[PDB]
Amino acid sequence: VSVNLEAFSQAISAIQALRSSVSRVFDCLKDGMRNKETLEGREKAFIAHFQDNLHSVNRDLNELERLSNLVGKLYSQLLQAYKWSNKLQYHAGLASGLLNQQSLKRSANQMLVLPPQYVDDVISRIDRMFPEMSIHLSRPNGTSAMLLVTLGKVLKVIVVMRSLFIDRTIVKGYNENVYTEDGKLDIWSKSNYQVFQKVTDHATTALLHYQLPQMPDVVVRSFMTWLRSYIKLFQAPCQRCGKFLQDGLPPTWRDFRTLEAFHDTCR
Amino acid sequence: GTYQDRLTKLQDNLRQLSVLFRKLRLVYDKCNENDPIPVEQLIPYVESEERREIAEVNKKLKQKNQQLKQIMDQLRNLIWDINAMLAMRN
Amino acid sequence: MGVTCVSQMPVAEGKSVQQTVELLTRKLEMLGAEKQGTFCVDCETYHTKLMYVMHNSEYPLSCFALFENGPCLIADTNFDVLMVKLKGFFQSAKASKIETRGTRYQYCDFLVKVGTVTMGPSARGISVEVEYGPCVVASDCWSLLLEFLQSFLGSHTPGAPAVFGNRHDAVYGPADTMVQYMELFNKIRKQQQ
Amino acid sequence: QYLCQPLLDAVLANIRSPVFNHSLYRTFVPAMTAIHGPPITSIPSVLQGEVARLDPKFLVNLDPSHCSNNGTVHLICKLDDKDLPSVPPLELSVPADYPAQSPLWIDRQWQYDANPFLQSVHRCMTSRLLQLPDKHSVTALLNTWAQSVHQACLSAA
Amino acid sequence: SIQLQLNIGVEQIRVVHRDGRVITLSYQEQELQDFLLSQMSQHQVHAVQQLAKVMGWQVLSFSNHVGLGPIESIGNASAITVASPSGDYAISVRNGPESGSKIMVQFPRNQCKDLPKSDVLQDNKWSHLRGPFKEVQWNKMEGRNFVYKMELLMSALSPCLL
Amino acid sequence: KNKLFIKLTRLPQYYIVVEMLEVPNKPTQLSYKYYFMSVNPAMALLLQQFKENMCAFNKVLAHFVAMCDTNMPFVGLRLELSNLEIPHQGVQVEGDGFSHAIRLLKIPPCKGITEETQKALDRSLLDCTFRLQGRNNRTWVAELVFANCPLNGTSTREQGPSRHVYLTYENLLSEPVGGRKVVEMFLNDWNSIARLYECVLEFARSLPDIPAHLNIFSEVRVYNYRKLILCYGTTKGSSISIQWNSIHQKFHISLGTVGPNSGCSNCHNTILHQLQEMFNKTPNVVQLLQVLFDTQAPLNAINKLPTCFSILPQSSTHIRLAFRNMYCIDIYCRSRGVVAIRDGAYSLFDNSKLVEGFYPAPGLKTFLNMFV
Amino acid sequence: SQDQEEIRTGVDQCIQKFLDIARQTECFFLQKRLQLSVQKPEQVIKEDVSELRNELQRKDALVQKHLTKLRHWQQVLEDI
């Protein structure tokens, strides 16, 4: 356990700060006087500093017991070869660096085929968690995969891929026939809802926002992570206007890199 | 055994890095071999037969762009024919 | 289907039954909501076991058949054909025309069924019903309906419906709203007046 | 705050004492230095900031007449605009401590005569300047003087 | 930043842009013909905004639409002004659909040696600031592209590095 | 009856009225009357009939709408400058016509520091004009300029009489861009610049008088009016950060390895919680520099001991090594490379009494004296 | 080489001076070839011919490639 082993740090610092502060109380009163020209700038500062250091000792004493309340509670030769592997984890963090994703790219101008089973292995990696959502991969038309996604009791989404990249994505509710009369997945239709049609535009702006020229897996992973915030729809008020409805519209627009529900007017 | 591939990859990368370092030193000497005239002549103040070749080939490449433009327009007509085929194939 | 709140508000010391109704409609016109037509819910009881054989104008094919408290059959026309044949197991038990009659309004996919309550010909109440379309799951959007209730009712703002105590995470059903309507009828039938 | 009143009561009892610095020394000095360790081994700058961001279409300079190096200052304005015709140059009057006071402007009625256009300029001055707020800067008066020339030119043209 | 996606209905038009906008138009082809050029004006406006975000010519003022001066017949003009981190040079220009590229660069005093010194103007510390202006034309000047013309000129007025 | 109400998205409670009007002679043309009005709990507040100076555009209105959203955002800025009584010029045009700005004339200088500081900072500024940029037009910029810097850096900030520093500020979505809290934090950081520029002179007079062993020992590299660095060591192998922290009312000195000449880490951090404590007492940079110049040699091998050995430090140059849990070491650094070596496990004061857990360690000085 | 705060500073000020030392070479290169741009007009039109000739080949490089490709769907289509 480490909650007590790190909560002890404040108390073990506070007792030494008590020793140092009472030493200050002793020697500052033992320092005598430093007039610095006028006496009224000293003798009125005498009671000021005498209150200051004594009250510092007092507040240190006081904050000692609120930390004390929250806390609770071959022989040494082979011990040395144990923690070095644990500090090798820090050594892994030694060469990380904070440069991360950001680079200094210029223009990319000078002077392919992948199996659908690779797409299936891609979709199997992230479907394994988030059990409230489901993924149903299908290719009734060509090698391109379009997927049915159910979101608890809320949303039914068709997500069309092509050429291993993104093609389209249309979201509807939970009580509609997303299939056709023949039973195939619907391709060209409309969600028949003002809020859903409004947020499909946000989805189209988001798919053109996540731009990786080589790595579309993180593009679609960030897309579905963004979509995961939309299971909180009709349940969270807007962050700037307080109320849900802006002209009758609840907040939906999650901002880029900061996922919280907004409107177009609410930015 | 995955560690060996990464280190061999980085060894080839640093070999190409050293080659690029030496070739930029070479071209830096090549560009620095000729400069007498200094800067501040460069600020734009308000106060032979190769040009015939340029003028003659500009309109030839424009004419080639238009000649391929009619061809790709015919292919546009073809693709507008072909997208309606699958549209009502069933 | 969508999450519904059903309640009564009285004459409330202003003129008559329909004066407060007209005040609510002119408030809604100040907001500016368009109409979608009218609505009426009619009830009728039967007994040997109280049979609530009951109808709604929103879904005229939906013939509701309820116990006093048991299962509900949202059945078709041929069930009404079969219902006539018994007549000795389940007596007619007439004079149960407790109805809610009014109009429906729309404001950006928001729907309102507002009207007056009558015991047949004589109106002795005002039915207030608010709802939203895309409310699929129940007990997750009650803040929206509470805000909508305090937006334009002012006084007599209701809360905590009886079917909200029937907590489940599935899709809200028309039986829940329907239940609310028969609980409304039980609330109004006691006072008569 | 809690159990510190001996320390508080000692200093008030030992105050107004000439042996205070020595009584405290005698009662306290060996306790901390023994265990805890031994001892160690012309014009104001307001107008200068004002004229910095004044419009180049004004070329205002000091008056050649009147007193100098004193509290009250006077600045005669020059307007070099090809858009606007010639007008009298105008002269202000600002006393000492230019912030937080309301200055004035000179008066000469006969200079704006021989033309009703100049009389309309003067009437527009009396219209605009009488509603100017208190303690305003010279930019407001300069710009209201500038815009009234166009406001009279549109009526003249 | 410039992405144009067009949904083609029978009589309804949906336009998808980067900044999250939907546009519906009529049967008239000119209603899209003028609008694409109006957004090309915004393209030329923002071709300078993101250009300065790399090499560090810090931006001072930027507005989506301005109306200072005349009134544009096609659309609404915009204005953006920046300054160099290297001292004396700042860029001020207003671009419009019909009146675009009005470049008046800003220069300090005691450099052209022509701005007059008043009697009150006696201290030299305030004289190093960017008082006067000078118009620089967009014609008979180097650069084969719109940003290529300006990038040569902003890198021209620079301190001596050699 | 022919009117429309237009509200600025950034600036609500204000409206544009286009009183569209007809011409009787021409049955196929129109006219407009453009007005300005504010809406409050709502009431109309003012009127401004706007002046006379294929036909389906009305660029006159869009010309107006631009000058709506590009000028009245300046209303709250000039409002609060007088409301807290700051000398400031009003609505202007910055140079070329397509521009607007507000120039601040004077600032209320200071408190709590000797007043000769107030002059030179008033001498250091010449201009305090503000500008607005950024997306949604909510990014204020303030390039507050400073001539006659006390001291440059070893980098190429060694140039002429100007230090212009961009100071950007932005309010919340609610309580708009004219917000008193935004200038409230503006005076905070300037005070933070002020308290450090206060200490700039307070060591600039301590600049010409140094023993100058710290000149070649330690080199100043980064001065930025807010932070200061040193790069110390004979190999310039470590660095210390100098930066004020207002909510702490403290300085968070960062002991850090710089340069490709070190072993495992910076390793000055054993005394980290102790060096911070001493500079609570002193605002004197030499106090920091000289302690390093003394403890460089003994602490070089103190941290290199195995672990058996540990670093539990008492006071500065009161360093206390301890072998396991029964033997102890005392090391006391001093100037000119002097270290005082106590027994550790003895008692200084009692020969009747000793330490319970540390059984006394005799014979230590003989092992020292053989080194002697 | 042979507690994090040195690392964040060390990876910073090297890089920020390294982008400092790089962007000025651009402006130095901006100086050097603007010198060559304005002191002589011939190296401008040499490189202008150089880019269009290299465009002239790659234009021609694809069109009879396209034509050979055009010949490809010939027999692909008579397979029925």
Ligand SMILES: [Zn+2]
């Ligand atoms: Zn909102």
